[PDB]
Amino acid sequence: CGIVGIAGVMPVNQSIYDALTVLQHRGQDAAGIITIDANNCFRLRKANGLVSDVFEARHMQRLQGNMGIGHVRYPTAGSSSASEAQPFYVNSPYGITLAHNGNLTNAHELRKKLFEEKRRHINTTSDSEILLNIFASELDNFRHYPLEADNIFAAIAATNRLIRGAYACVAMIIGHGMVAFRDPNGIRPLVLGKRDIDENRTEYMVASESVALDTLGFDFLRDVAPGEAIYITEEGQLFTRQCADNPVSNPCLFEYVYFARPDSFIDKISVYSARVNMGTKLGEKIAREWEDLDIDVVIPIPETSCDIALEIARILGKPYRQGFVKNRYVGRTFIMPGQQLRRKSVRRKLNANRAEFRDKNVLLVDDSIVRGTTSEQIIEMAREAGAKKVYLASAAPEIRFPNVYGIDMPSATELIAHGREVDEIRQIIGADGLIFQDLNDLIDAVRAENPDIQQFECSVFNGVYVTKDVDQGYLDFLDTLRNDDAKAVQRQ
Amino acid sequence: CGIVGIAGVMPVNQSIYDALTVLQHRGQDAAGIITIDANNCFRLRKANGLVSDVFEARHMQRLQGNMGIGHVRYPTAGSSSASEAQPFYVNSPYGITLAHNGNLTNAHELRKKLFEEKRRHINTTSDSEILLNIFASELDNFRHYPLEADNIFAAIAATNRLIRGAYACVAMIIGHGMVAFRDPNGIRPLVLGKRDIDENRTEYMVASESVALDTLGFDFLRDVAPGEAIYITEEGQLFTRQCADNPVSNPCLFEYVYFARPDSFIDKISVYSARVNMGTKLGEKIAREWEDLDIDVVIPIPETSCDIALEIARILGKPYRQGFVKNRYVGRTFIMPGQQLRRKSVRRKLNANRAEFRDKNVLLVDDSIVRGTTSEQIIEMAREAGAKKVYLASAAPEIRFPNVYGIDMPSATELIAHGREVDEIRQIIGADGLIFQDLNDLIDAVRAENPDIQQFECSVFNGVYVTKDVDQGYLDFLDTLRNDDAKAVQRQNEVENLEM
Amino acid sequence: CGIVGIAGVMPVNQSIYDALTVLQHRGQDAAGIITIDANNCFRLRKANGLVSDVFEARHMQRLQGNMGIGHVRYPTAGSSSASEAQPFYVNSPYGITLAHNGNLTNAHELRKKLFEEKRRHINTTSDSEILLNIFASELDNFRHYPLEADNIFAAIAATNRLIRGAYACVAMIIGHGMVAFRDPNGIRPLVLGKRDIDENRTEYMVASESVALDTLGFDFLRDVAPGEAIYITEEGQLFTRQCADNPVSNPCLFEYVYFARPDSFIDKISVYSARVNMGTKLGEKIAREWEDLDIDVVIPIPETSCDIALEIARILGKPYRQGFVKNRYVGRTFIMPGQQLRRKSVRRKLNANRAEFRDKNVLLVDDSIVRGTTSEQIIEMAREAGAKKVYLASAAPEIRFPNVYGIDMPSATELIAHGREVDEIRQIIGADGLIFQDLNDLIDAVRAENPDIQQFECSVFNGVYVTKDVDQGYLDFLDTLRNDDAKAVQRQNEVENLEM
Amino acid sequence: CGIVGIAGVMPVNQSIYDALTVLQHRGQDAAGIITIDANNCFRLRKANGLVSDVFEARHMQRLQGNMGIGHVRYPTAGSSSASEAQPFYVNSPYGITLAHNGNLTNAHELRKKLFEEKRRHINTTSDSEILLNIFASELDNFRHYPLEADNIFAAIAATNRLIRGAYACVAMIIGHGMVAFRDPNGIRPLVLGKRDIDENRTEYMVASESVALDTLGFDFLRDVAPGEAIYITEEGQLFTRQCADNPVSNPCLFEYVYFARPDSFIDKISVYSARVNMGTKLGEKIAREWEDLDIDVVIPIPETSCDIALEIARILGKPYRQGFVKNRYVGRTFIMPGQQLRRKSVRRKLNANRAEFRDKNVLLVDDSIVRGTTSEQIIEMAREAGAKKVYLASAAPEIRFPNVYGIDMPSATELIAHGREVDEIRQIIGADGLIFQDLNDLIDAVRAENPDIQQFECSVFNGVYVTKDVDQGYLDFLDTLRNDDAKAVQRQ
Numbered sequence A, D: 001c002g003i004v005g006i007a008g009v010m011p012v013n014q015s016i017y018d019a020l021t022v023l024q025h026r027g028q029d030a031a032g033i034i035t036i037d038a039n040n041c042f043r044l045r046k047a048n049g050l051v052s053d054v055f056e057a058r059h060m061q062r063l064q065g066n067m068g069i070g071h072v073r074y075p076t077a078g079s080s081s082a083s084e085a086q087p088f089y090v091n092s093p094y095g096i097t098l099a100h101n102g103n104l105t106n107a108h109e110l111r112k113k114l115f116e117e118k119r120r121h122i123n124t125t126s127d128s129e130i131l132l133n134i135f136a137s138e139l140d141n142f143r144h145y146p147l148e149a150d151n152i153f154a155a156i157a158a159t160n161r162l163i164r165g166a167y168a169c170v171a172m173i174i175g176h177g178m179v180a181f182r183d184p185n186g187i188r189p190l191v192l193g194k195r196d197i198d199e200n201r202t203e204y205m206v207a208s209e210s211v212a213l214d215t216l217g218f219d220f221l222r223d224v225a226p227g228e229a230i231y232i233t234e235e236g237q238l239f240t241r242q243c244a245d246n247p248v249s250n251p252c253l254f255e256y257v258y259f260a261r262p263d264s265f266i267d268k269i270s271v272y273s274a275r276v277n278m279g280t281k282l283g284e285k286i287a288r289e290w291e292d293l294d295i296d297v298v299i300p301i302p303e304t305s306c307d308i309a310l311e312i313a314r315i316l317g318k319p320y321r322q323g324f325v326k327n328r329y330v331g332r333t334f335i336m337p338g339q340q341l342r343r344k345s346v347r348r349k350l351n352a353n354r355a356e357f358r359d360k361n362v363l364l365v366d367d368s369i370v371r372g373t374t375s376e377q378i379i380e381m382a383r384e385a386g387a388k389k390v391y392l393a394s395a396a397p398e399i400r401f402p403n404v405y406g407i408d409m410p411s412a413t414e415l416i417a418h419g420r421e422v423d424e425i426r427q428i429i430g431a432d433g434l435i436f437q438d439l440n441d442l443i444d445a446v447r448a449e450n451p452d453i454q455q456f457e458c459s460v461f462n463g464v465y466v467t468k469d470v471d472q473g474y475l476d477f478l479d480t481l482r483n484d485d486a487k488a489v490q491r492q
Numbered sequence B, C: 001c002g003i004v005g006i007a008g009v010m011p012v013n014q015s016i017y018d019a020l021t022v023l024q025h026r027g028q029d030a031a032g033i034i035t036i037d038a039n040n041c042f043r044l045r046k047a048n049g050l051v052s053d054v055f056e057a058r059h060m061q062r063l064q065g066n067m068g069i070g071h072v073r074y075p076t077a078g079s080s081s082a083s084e085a086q087p088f089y090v091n092s093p094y095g096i097t098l099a100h101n102g103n104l105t106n107a108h109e110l111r112k113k114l115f116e117e118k119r120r121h122i123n124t125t126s127d128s129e130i131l132l133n134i135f136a137s138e139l140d141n142f143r144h145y146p147l148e149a150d151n152i153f154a155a156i157a158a159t160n161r162l163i164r165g166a167y168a169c170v171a172m173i174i175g176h177g178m179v180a181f182r183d184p185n186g187i188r189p190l191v192l193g194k195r196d197i198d199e200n201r202t203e204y205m206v207a208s209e210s211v212a213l214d215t216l217g218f219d220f221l222r223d224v225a226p227g228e229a230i231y232i233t234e235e236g237q238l239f240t241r242q243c244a245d246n247p248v249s250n251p252c253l254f255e256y257v258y259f260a261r262p263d264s265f266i267d268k269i270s271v272y273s274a275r276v277n278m279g280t281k282l283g284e285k286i287a288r289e290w291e292d293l294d295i296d297v298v299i300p301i302p303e304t305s306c307d308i309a310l311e312i313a314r315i316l317g318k319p320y321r322q323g324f325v326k327n328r329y330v331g332r333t334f335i336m337p338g339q340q341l342r343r344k345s346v347r348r349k350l351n352a353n354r355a356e357f358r359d360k361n362v363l364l365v366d367d368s369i370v371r372g373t374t375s376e377q378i379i380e381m382a383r384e385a386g387a388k389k390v391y392l393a394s395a396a397p398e399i400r401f402p403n404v405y406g407i408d409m410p411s412a413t414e415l416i417a418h419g420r421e422v423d424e425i426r427q428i429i430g431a432d433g434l435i436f437q438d439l440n441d442l443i444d445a446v447r448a449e450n451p452d453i454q455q456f457e458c459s460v461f462n463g464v465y466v467t468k469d470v471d472q473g474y475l476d477f478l479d480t481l482r483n484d485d486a487k488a489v490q491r492q493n494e495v496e497n498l499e500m
C-alpha cells in the first residue's frame, strides 16, 4: 500500500491525487482521499479501482481544503478487495482519520483490548482500523483543549508501546493538524518534504516514496526516522519527536527488489542503483558457478529486471536482448454462457519475440520467484519460441517465508521454495538451470548505497522476524483470515 | 489505429477483445467490436475508452458468433473523440461492416460522388465511412445470390481504382465472410495468420500487427501483399487475389520508429531489430560528428528509445543509465476554481532520478521531435536535476511534413523542424547540442532486415507523397476538418463542467 | 409505443424530451431521440430505460438541430428489451430515420422481398425496421435532386400498397424534412399541432397523443387522417396528401379503455369522457342485471378505473371509496440465495386500506381482465382485508383475441376469457360475481363523443381483423418471435448474475 | 423523511428495501440501508436518489443479516441534498447506527456540549448525527457488559432529558439489538408491527407509516406511544418502556393534510378518512360563505386533493371533473450551450384537459398553499383553457409559520400567507376567489377519527410551538443554515 499526506497553504485535492498516481504501483485495488475543509470537517472519497477511476470531477469538487491525506491499497490478509478501503475514520476524540502501509502482528489482541477496555467497535478486519482506534484511544486521555504537540507525541509514544509490527502512517486530527509516524524498526518506507510558497509560507508533505515529492515540486528533506513522529499544525508549524525506545533502521529489503519505484531514494539508497548492484552480484555469481555453460543471450522478464539483466549481460560479456515484451494493457476474462472458459495465461501479460529465442541457450532474468507459476509458463513460452536450453536467474534469494509486515505474500504452502531445494524448484518449473541471488549478496548490493544500515528486514528470505512474535500459530491465524477474505471476494 | 478480424469455428468475442488489448498502443481513444451471430445479424459494441473499459460482461454477452472484427481508435482529422467510432456499418447491399487504419486522400471527391451518383449519405467526417460506402456501392452491382469470391474481389478491385491514399481494412459481409485488403503501396500494416483445429477446419485472422496473432496462439502466415485482398467464407475457406493494378511495397517508415510494438514483424522486418539498427546508425553518426564532445552518460527518454540508447551507448563506449522514468499512470487534471500551484505538464509524464544527472554532461535519446515543446521541457528537467551539458539525439530524422496516410501529425507550420536548420531547433529547445538520424541511415537500418523493400513511405521526412495528390488545397481542407473536430470536443466539455 | 416529431425554428432537443415524458405511459422499456444538426447529419441517443434516465446532459449536447423525432418503447413480439430500440436508421437513399407505433401483419413477406429484390438487410426482428426499408426503397426511385413533395408522397403511397397492418409513423429525410403518416384504417393514434413564432415561421409537430402538443404549448390542429401523410420541409412549409386507396376510420378501441392518457383527444373523442361514459354504461348494466345484490361500496382498482367506478357508484347510488392505493414506487426483486419470505406479487403493486373492506360486500372495478392472474390476487386481497362478498366489474368487454396492431396482448390460449363463459371465469378468479361491459355499450360510450366514427378496431374483443390477413400461421409465427425474444432476455440475465 | 427497522429471523435486506419503496413519498433525495451481519458488523449502502436507484444487486448482496434499518431522505435545513445521508454511524460505544425523522430545536447547543464535554466531532450539519452522538454518549456510561434492557432505556431517558424537538427514531447497537423511540409529544409518526414465523419465532418492525407493515405481511400492533421506547434483542425478545416525563399525544396535523399515504393509520386515524372529512368541512364552509357564487364544476389539483374535492362536489351538489392530469413522469431541464434556458413550469408537472374549463366558473381544490407560485400558474392555466371565473379552495388553513419539527418549509418570508390576509393572497395569485379551511375545522376532521387526541402539533398554522423554545433568533439561525446548504448544492 502507499500513503501520502499534504499540509498545504492552498487546495491539496489535485496534489494528493497526483501524488497517488505516482505511488500507484504500491496498490491498484482501491484509493482514498480525505481532506479537512474550511469548516473543520472531513470530506472523503474512497472506492475500489485505480486512482484515475476512483476520483471523478464531482468527488474532487467535494474534497475541499488545504490539508489532506491519501491511500492506494494493495489487497492483503484482513483487507480483501471487497472490504472497506482506507483512509479509516473515527469521530472521537476530536475527529481522526488515518492511512497506513504495514501490518500489526498483535492486531487480534489489540482488537480484544479495544472492545473490552474502551467499548470501541472495529467494523472491518483491517489492522489499520485497529491502529487508528488505539491512537484515538490514547488521544482521548486529555482534558485541556486544544492538545499541545506534547500530548500528540505522548499519545503516539503510548501507541508505539502497545502495537507491534511494521507501519508507516499518516493521520489528521480535526482542529489540530497532520501527524506522520514510523515503526521503531524503520521497516515500512516514509519520507518528508517541503515546498516554500513564500517568505512566510511553507507546505509539508510525507509519502511512502520520494517520487511523490518529486512530481509535485516538493524538496526532499529526509526519511522519517524509525520511531519518529512528525506533527504539522494547521497553521503550518512543524514539530518532530522520537516516539519509541531503542529505535533502529531495519528497512524492508523487498521494497528494493521490485516493490518501490527505481527513482525513489529509500533510506538514502537509490532503488535503481541498488538494482543495478543486484545484477552485478548475480552476474558475478553466474560467471563463477556457471562458467562452463553455453549461454547465447540474456533476456529479462519485464519490467523491473531489464536493468538487472542488462548488468548481468555486461558482467557475463553476453548480448542483452528484449526477448519478452510486457503487454501494457491487460484485460479481463469473461464468464460467458455456453462458452468454455479456458486457460489462465501469462501470455495475456507477456509476449515472446519469436526471433529472439530460436536455436539459442537463453538465460532469462526475473526479479524473484514466489508461486513459481508464471516462471513455469514463461520458460514454456521460451521453448515454444524455439529456445534450446532455458536457464533462469532470480534477482532475489529463495522466498520461503510469509511477510507479516505489509507486503502481500501467499501462505508458506503456496511458496514454491518453501521446504524445497534449488534443484527441486528447478525441476518443477522445468528449467534447464536455476540460480538465486545469495541473501548476503542482496544485502551488500543495497547496503553499498548506504553502509549505515546494519541490518534489513529480511523475513521472507530467512524466516527471522525482528518483532519476535511470529510463530506457526500466528501464521495459521493469518491463513484463516485469507479464507474469510476469499469467501467475501468470491461473493462479489 | 489498429484493426483485427477473426474468422473462426468457435466464439470470437474474447479473442477479438484480447487481440485489441495488444494492439491498444495504436489508439486508446475508442474501441469497437462487431460479430455476426448464428442468425446472420450484426452484434456491435463500440464507445470511447480503452478496450478494458469499453467492453463489459453485458456487451460481451451480446457479441455472439464465430466471426468478427475489431478496431481501436487514435483520433485524427475527421475523427475526433466526440465523433462516432469504428467499425462503421451499412445495411445494403447485404449488410457490410468495415474497420480501417489509414487515410483516403480523395475522401472529399468520393463523398460528392457517393451523394450524386448513389444517394448514399455519409453521417460522419470519417473517410473510413466513405471507404465503406464505395465498397458497398461496388458490391451492389451483382444480380445473383450468393456472391462468388470473384465478385467480391471484383468489387475490391473497383474500389481500389476509385480510392486513393493508404489503408489496411478488414470487413464482413453478411451471408458471405470476412475480407481484408491493403492499399496498392503497402503503406499501412496488415498480417494474416491461422489456427488449425482439425482436418479441414482452420481459423483465420488478420490484424495490424503480428503481436495480435502471437497473443492468440495463431500461426503467422505472412503480410497481406500490397493491393491484395483476402477472403474467408463463413464455411472456413480461404481465397486471395491481387486487387490492384501496380502494387508496390512502400511500408510506412514511422511504424518502425515508434508506432508499432517492437515484437512485431512488419513486412519481414523485426521492429525491435530495426530500432537496434537505428541506434547503431545514430551512434556511429555521433561518434563521427560529435567526436570532440565529452558525454558522461547516455540516457533514454522512455519508452521507445531505451534499446536505441543502449545501442548508442554501446557504440560510443559510454554508460547507459535510466535517468528518466515514465509515470506508468497518469491522471486527469481537473479544472478547479483557482488551481493554485499546478503540477508541471512534463512531470505528469516523467520523473527524473536526481542522482543520474548531477554534474554530468548527458546525452539524451528520444524517438523523434515533432512540436519540440516536450523536448524543451525534458532538457529543462535534466538541467534542474543537476546536468551540466545536455545533448539531444533523435532516432528519427527531422520531421518536416504532415502525414496524410493515417498517422496523426500536426500541420507543416507546427513542426519545429519545418523551415529550420538543426542549430535553430537546438537554440529553440535549449539543448547544448542537437543531432538527428540521417534519412538514408534510417532507411538502411530498416532495410537491413529485409533488402527486398527498396522504398519506404517517407513523406513526413522528405515531403514526397506516393499518391501524388497532396497539395495545399488538401492540406487546408484537413485543417478545416481538425478545427470542426476541436469545436465538437470543446462543446462536449462545456456542459460536462456546467452539469456540476 | 409513442412517437413524436417536431419541425421547429429553434433547438428541439428539450422539447422532444419533454413531449416523450408525457407520452412515457405508452412504453417505459426504451427511448430514443434523433435530430438533424446544422450540417445535415443525424445525431442520436437511444437506450433502455425511462426518458429521464436515457438522456443525460452529454447526450442532449450532441442532439443539436431544429428538427427531430422521438420514440418510447413498449416491448412486443419482435422487439424485446434486449433488442435495438427506435428510432431506426438507414443511410441510403439520402439518410432516413423513422419511428413507429403499430405492427405490420405482412412483415415476414416484406423482409423476404427486401432481401431478394433490394439486397436490404434487416438486422433486428422489428417490423419497424422493415417499414423503414420499404419506405427507403420506394424513395430510391427518383433521379433528380432534391425530391419534390409529390415524390415523397408517391413513395409513401407506394409503401402503403406494399405494407399491411397498423401504423402511426414519423420520419425524417436528410435534406428534405419530416414526414408523418397513418395506416389506411386510422387504427393507431397520431395528431398534428403547430406553434406560430412570427409572420410565416410556424413550427409543426406530430405525436401519438394530444397531451404532447399541450405540454409544449402547441396549438392542436387535428388528427392525421387515415392513410394521410404530412410533410414539413426544413424551410418550414406544410404539405399533406391522402396516400391510401380506401381510407377508413377504425380507431383502436383499446386506447380509449386504458392505454392513452385521459386528457387526450383521439379522433375528436375525449378519452376522459369516453371512460366516464364507460362507467355510465356499465353502471346501468349492473343496475339492470345485479338488481338483487347488496353492494355496500364501489372501489376502483387504480388507476384507470377511478373515474369509471365513480360514475358507476353514481348510477348505482352507492358510495365510492378508495379501497386500494397503487404503490407509486415499485422496486426490483433481487434473486438472492434462499429468499426466505418473499413479498407478494400483488402487494408490490397495490395496498389495501383495511378499513374500507371490513364486513362489506364490495364491488371492485378494473379496466379489463387479460390473464386473470392479478384479478384473482386482488380479490383475495379484499377478502383478506375483511370483505364479505367481492364482485368484479370490468370496464372492457371480454378480451378473447390477440392484438396484432401494436398493442401487446398474450396469445389466445393465454387469455382467461378465451373459450370460457363469464361464470367459468368467475369461478377461476374466485369472485362472488363477475360482470363485463357489453361490446356495443363500449362502442356507444366512445362513439357518443364523435358519431362520425362508425366502426372501431375491436379484434381483441370480437376476433374481427380489418386487414383480413391474420391466420394461425401468422399467430404461430408471432409466438416464435416472442420465444426468441425471451431467450435473448434470459441470456442477458444469466451473466448479469454470474458477474457477481 | 421516513424510517424503517426490522428485527427478523431471516435476511432483511429485500424487506427493508421493499418497506422503503412504500415510504418513498416521505423523501426522494436519498436512501440508506444498514444491516448487522453474522459477524456483528454493519454493512451499509446509502446515496442520493430514489430507493430503486440507490440499491443495485451488488449492494444488496453486501447487506447481509437478519436485523437492519433504513431511511429515505427529504432535504431540510442542515441536511442539504449534497450532504451525507442517513443512517448515521458511530463506532463507540459498541457500534451504533441511527435513522431519524424529525428535528431537534436545540441541536446547536447539543453540538457544543458534545464537543466540549465529550470531544465528539459532528461531521455534518444534520441534527440526526447530533441525536446519535447524544445517545451514544449516554450509552457510554456503562461498565458491565453486555448492557441490560434497563441500561438502554436509561440512556434513552437521559437522552430525552437533553434533546428537545420532534423525533421518530430507530437504531441498532452491535451485540444488543434494535431500539425505536418517539418524542414526548408524539409529533413524528412511528408504528410497531410483528410477523409470526412459527410457534417460537416472531419478527418485529417499526416504520414511519403502517403501509410499510402492510406491504410486508406484518401485523399492526400499535403506534409507539409518545416518549416510549422499544427494544428488541438480537434473540428476538421485545421490551417496551416509557422513557419520558409527562408524555402527551400532539401528532403533526400536517402529515394528515398531504404528507402521509392515505392508506396509513396514524395514531388510530385513517389518513384517507381524515381527508374525506376535510372535504366535508371545506364543502360546508363553501356552501355557507359562497352561497351566491356561480360554480359550474369542482376540479381537484392532483393528487391528494381528488378525494377532498370529490367530497366537496358532493356536499355542494356540483359535478366533479378531472380538469387536471398530473404528469407521472417528470424530467429535468438542461443547461445547453447557446440555447436560451426558458421557463420553470408547472406545465411539466400538470396538464389541463382543455374541454373541462371552457366557458365555466371553476372551483379548483388544492391540499394547501405555501409559496403560492404553483397555484398562480395553475389558475393561469385554467384561464388559458377558457375558464371564466376561477376560484381556489385550500384543504389546509393558511401556512404562515415555518415548521421546525421535521417537515421542510421555506422561511417565513417565502410563505405567501405570512403577514397577508386572504384577499391580498388572492390578488397576488390572481384568483377570482380564495377560501382556506378553518384550523378548528381541520382539527375536527382529523380528531373525529380519534377523539382521544386533545391537541395536535399545529405550528405551521398558528405559530404555537409546543416545545416552547422557538423565537425569531432561532428561525434566523435556521435561515443561515439554508444559505450554507444552498452554496453546497449550487456547487454540485
Ligand SMILES: O=S(=O)(O)CCN1CCN(CCS(=O)(=O)O)CC1
Pocket: A044, A045, A046, A047, A083, A084, A085, D042, D043, D044, D045, D062, D063
Ligand atoms: O468514498 S465515498 O464516500 O464515495 C464511499 C464511502 N464508502 C463506501 C463503502 N463503505 C463500505 C461498504 S460495507 O462494507 O459496509 O458494505 C465504506 C464507505
Ligand SMILES: O=S(=O)(O)CCN1CCN(CCS(=O)(=O)O)CC1
Pocket: A042, A043, A044, A045, A062, A063, D044, D045, D046, D047, D083, D084, D085
Ligand atoms: O465526505 S463527503 O461529504 O464528501 C461524502 C460523504 N460520504 C458519501 C459516501 N457514503 C458511503 C457510500 S456507500 O457505502 O453507502 O455506498 C459515506 C458518506
Ligand SMILES: *CC(=O)CC[C@H](N)C(=O)O
Pocket: C001, C002, C027, C073, C074, C075, C076, C077, C078, C079, C100, C101, C102, C103, C104, C126, C127, C128, C129, C406
Ligand atoms: C410499441 C409498438 O408500437 C411496436 C412497434 C413495432 N411493432 C415494433 O418495433 O415491434
